[PDB]
Design a protein around this ligand. Structure first.
Ligand SMILES: */C=C/C1=C(C)C(=O)N/C1=C\C1=NC(=C\c2[nH]c(/C=C3\NC(=O)C(C=C)=C3C)c(C)c2CCC(=O)O)/C(CCC(=O)O)=C1C
Ligand SMILES: *C=CC1=C(C)C(=O)N/C1=C\C1=NC(=C\c2[nH]c(/C=C3\NC(=O)C(C=C)=C3C)c(C)c2CCC(=O)O)/C(CCC(=O)O)=C1C
Ligand SMILES: [Cl-]
Lengths: 593, 606
């Protein structure tokens, strides 16, 4: 139920500032935070329904009507012309202009040489190698700039769990660097708002919130969507957490990379600390700058890998096409590249009952168990829902029966997906134990994750899909290998054979294959005979009819008929239908001693 | 010789400021620009070898020793304590701290838009950070920077794959002819110049045709090397380039590097037809917008690749299943397949070849013309082309690569051909029709002023590496066709053989560790033996005859197997029941490419 909280409609503000909801129609204040009455000259009752111009004046920029896309005015100087001296400090206001509402949030200026001071840090990260180096540079650098007791770089993993990859802290305290946090700690709903509103601040934990006096819109009958307002009251859940932790102030800047939430810049203060708009703007700058390099280094990385992976793949393709006899040594020379293209620990090449095991891989019988399990009708759903190839990161999860084997085959890539059989390819990765330091799931916990291999890189997975061609290459080569063998065998027979292709009644019944013993009795050789109509009257009408009726229907016949001599030569014509997938005769076997 | 100039060691400074080289060992000035003597108070002779501290009055930040990675201190307030009221304008100094040397460059403050300019630039950075597509961001940056600093010209120069430039965006005075859309050669910006723009991201010329300030002790007095400015903004630019700008009428420069993915994507070129020094605060804002724009361009490039890459895969994967599912390739199968098959590679046409048959689709040359192209590629002359090729053979302009096939270009200017090996029977030809290019040059030292429009013919749109990998990823449709065809024929011959009367078996020759086993067995054969076909495949041949069979007769058969020769011997069969069944074993070697027997044909009759 907690992971289902609205959070964007709390109907409360952080007391450090004031919020006003204005009807753009008349320009009158429809809703207001309880803190408004004190800052502005007039108490609540009269302030409600009053025009905004009457109570607050702003010289820099003014609100305006918006058509569809909401527009946001940044923090500018705002004055309160309705009281005999109301500035116990300087005030600054920001707008959120919607087509049905105007949202003005105001807070003190403060400031205390900032954007120029941040420039050397930005420049220094914008050119440093690897994420690690940049993360730690940003951590230390922001700790110097904004001055928080803790500055940590929190990276989201694939299942949205966090990891503190970088940290800058006071000499005292215990480092949270290296700690793992669940996905449950930051709900989807919350994560969305960090992508929306990039810099989030908790000025003092355990603040006494300011409720928006008219809770719902008096004419729209809805609460205030505070999704863009910085004054948005945080979940009491999270507040209790921070309070239990001893941290009293919080600054969180979103590390958005390629329009995706990559991670967060988490800042904790064990005393209260309001970060003013000007400073928030600097942290946003460093977050974007860091966010930038991470994606730059990620790009250069992909680029490099992508090429070498192709160079290898392409060697594999030629080497396989060039060789006509798939030998043990062929597969032994091929094996390293075949493993390398996908960064596997082992590979097993299957060719119907035969297994060419290479690298660090389970025993032949164990490999058979894995294949037999995948090819199963139970896991039939798995292959369909799969994309080009079937792959696992922890065999024990996906195939609970195959829970063991994991020390050598924790992860695997399997090609082809169809239970096509004969030729297949099993790439394996051995179990790599993970030592993960939790937040407590008064001391530390180290989960020692077993039965999982290193995650299959999407780039390696596409490398795998790109090798499906080696499977049909084997199959094609194998059929062609067998075909010639059977063609050889047939031609060397004594009992005169020929295959007959049924003409779709448009074409006549023509010869497809003819053996040497057959083409001899006829006289003329094989190449002259391929593509010659079987209808080759002298021969009794009765006997021919029997043969013609078998062809007419797609049935069998056994009839003695005279041939063509270069004695006239009579033979017994043994026509027989060969099984068709459709069940409708398309070919016949003709033999006749 | 010009394309191999040092430029990083000119031994000269831009007169607008002063440069000093300091020995970090005991803080003395080892080298100095001729402009140093006038602003620092003390003339050259005594100023040389003197500690920086005597003329130091920098309160903000001080230099320091470094270890390995050089560090740079930003422009801060510096004062000259040797003269009574030394200037008329405030002076600012920046440091370049190297482990062997310290480089301090100083110049006037000026400002007239400082951090007020940094807040003023914030909504522009904000505006581009949100912008869709490069084209919109480029033009936003152009207009925005033209407003932020009053340059007469602001252009966004994009480097193409061959390091040639294109002015994709431009913001200018109402007057002066727009250079927007103009193409520049790679030769105009040399490799070493390009390298420095990746090194020093922001570079300005205050006034073209400045009287340079030489570094009085030309080489280091103790290290014996010249001063590598590289990071110093005061560095003197090539006279070559200065003459160019002068000929062009421009007097002031400001060039901010658009570095994307650690590579020089392009430049923000700013021209002023009068002189214009852009202050420390000034340069800093352009750097910001340069950082921001470069950011967004890469972001959009990533999201873009990501999107395309997926839809291509989705299509590719439909084609794979659709092709595997169909067992007899019909005209309608290929007609339904055709659009996706063209789309996966963004082709104008495609021709599917299945030995003498051609399924041509889209905008493609005639059947005979297609045959000419294939026959030419499959040629022994162009054998080198297919070897040097990667997964598939691809052309961007058929007339160049295949001079004989110079025509056909209106419909097949570019193509992708698969498979690479002259494997034949099955193939795939993707075509792209001629797209004429109209490229506006600067001129074709060179006066420019007059532009030339090159009208390139016989070329199709460049094959995207993403589309080329899409093509390579479809080689599987070729072996799929071939496999299907061989399997189709094999099954036919296997059918034919199994329905025979004479009683046939194929034998696979073993080794010293393996035995001679039956590969194929018909019914007529498996009947005489008794036990069925599936219960006989993989059976050792020695099994088939009785263990009572005369030593003499078996020997003859064993000799033939031992050597890989033929034999014809009557032998009793291994009768489960007890009825003596004898047959003439007609073993015969089947032709091998090597000529060394690998299989035998066994026929039975006696
Ligand atoms: C030696 C061959 C050269 C020829 C010919 C030529 O025209 N220039 C040559 C050399 C160098 N050019 C250098 C810098 C430079 N080049 C450009 C190019 C353009 N600027 C434009 O505005 C346009 C079109 C509108 C073009 C095609 C720019 C902008 C710059 C930087 C100076 C500036 O901002 O104008 C160069 C390096 C010089 C240096 O910094 O030392 C060399 C050697
Ligand atoms: C319900 C689920 C929640 C549990 C069990 C919990 O502890 N918090 C839950 C919900 C929310 N968390 C939110 C924000 C938030 N969590 C963290 C977590 C950490 N931050 C750290 O610095 C460390 C360790 C060093 C951990 C483990 C952070 C950083 C944030 C963001 C704010 C911050 O800086 O802490 C929210 C959103 C709150 C809101 O704005 O309403 C919810 C809900
Ligand atoms: Cl809203």
């Amino acid at each position: 139920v907690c992971a289902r909280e609205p959070i964007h409609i709390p109907g409360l503000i952080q007391p450090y500032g004031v919020l006003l909801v204005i009807d753009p129609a008349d320009g009158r204040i429809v809703q207001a935070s309880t803190t408004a009455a004190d800052l502005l000259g007039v108490p609540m009752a009269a302030l409600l329904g009053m025009p905004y111009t009457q109570v607050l004046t702003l010289p820099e920029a003014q609100p305006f009507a918006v058509d569809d896309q909401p527009q946001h005015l940044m923090h500018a100087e705002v004055r309160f012309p309705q009281r005999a001296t109301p500035p116990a400090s300087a005030w600054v206001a920001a707008w959120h202009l919607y087509p049905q509402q105007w949202l003005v949030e105001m807070e003190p200026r403060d400031a205390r040489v900032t954007l120029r001071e941040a420039m050397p840090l930005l420049r220094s990260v914008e050119r440093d190698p690897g994420i690690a180096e940049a993360a730690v540079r940003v951590a230390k650098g922001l700790r110097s700039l904004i001055g928080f007791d803790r500055v940590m770089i929190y990276r989201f993993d694939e299942e949205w769990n966090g990891d503190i990859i970088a940290e800058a802290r006071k000499p005292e305290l215990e480092a949270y660097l290296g700690l793992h946090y669940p996905a449950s700690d930051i709900p989807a709903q919350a994560r969305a708002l960090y992508l929306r509103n990039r810099v989030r601040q908790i000025a003092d934990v355990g603040y006494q919130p300011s409720p928006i006096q008219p809770t719902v819109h008096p004419q729209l009958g809805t609460p205030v969507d505070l999704s863009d307002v910085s004054l948005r009251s945080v979940s009491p859940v999270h507040l209790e957490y921070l309070a239990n932790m001893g941290v009293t102030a919080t600054l969180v800047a979103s590390i958005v990379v390629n329009d995706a939430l990559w991670g967060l810049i988490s800042c904790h203060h064990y005393s209260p600390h309001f970060t003013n708009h000007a400073m928030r703007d600097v942290t946003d700058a460093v977050a974007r700058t860091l966010a930038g390099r991470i994606g730059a280094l990620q790009a250069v990385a992909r680029a490099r890998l992508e090429s070498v992976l192709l160079t290898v793949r392409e060697k594999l393709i030629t080497d396989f096409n060039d060789a006509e006899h798939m030998t043990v040594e062929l597969l032994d020379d091929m094996a390293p590249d075949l493993m390398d293209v996908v960064d596997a620990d082992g590979v097993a090449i299957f060719h119907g009952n035969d297994i060419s095991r290479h690298g660090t891989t389970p025993d032949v019988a164990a490999l058979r168990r894995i294949r037999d399990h995948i090819e199963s009708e139970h896991h039939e759903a798995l292959r369909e829902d799969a994309v080009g190839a079937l792959h696992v990161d922890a065999i024990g999860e996906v195939f609970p029966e195959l829970a063991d084997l994991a020390p050598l085959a924790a992860g695997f890539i399997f090609v082809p997906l169809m239970p096509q059989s004969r030729s297949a390819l099993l790439w394996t990765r051995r179990e790599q134990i993970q030592q993960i330091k939790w937040a407590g799931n008064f001391d530390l916990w180290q989960q020692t994750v077993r039965g999982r291999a290193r995650r299959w890189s999407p780039l390696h997975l596409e490398s795998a899909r790109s090798l499906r061609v080696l499977i049909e290459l084997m199959e094609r080569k194998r059929f062609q290998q067998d075909f010639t063998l059977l063609e050889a065998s047939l031609s060397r027979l004594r009992d005169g054979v020929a295959i007959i292709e049924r003409g779709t009644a448009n074409a006549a019944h023509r010869l497809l294959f003819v053996n040497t013993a057959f083409a001899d009795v006829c006289g003329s050789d094989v190449a002259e005979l391929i593509g010659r109509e079987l209808q080759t009257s002298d021969a009794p009408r009765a006997n021919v009819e029997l043969l013609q009726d078998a062809l007419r229907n797609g049935r069998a016949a056994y009839v003695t008929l005279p041939l063509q001599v270069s004695a006239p030569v009579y033979r017994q014509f043994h026509l027989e239908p060969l099984p068709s997938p459709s069940g409708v005769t398309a070919h016949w076997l003709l033999q006749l001693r």
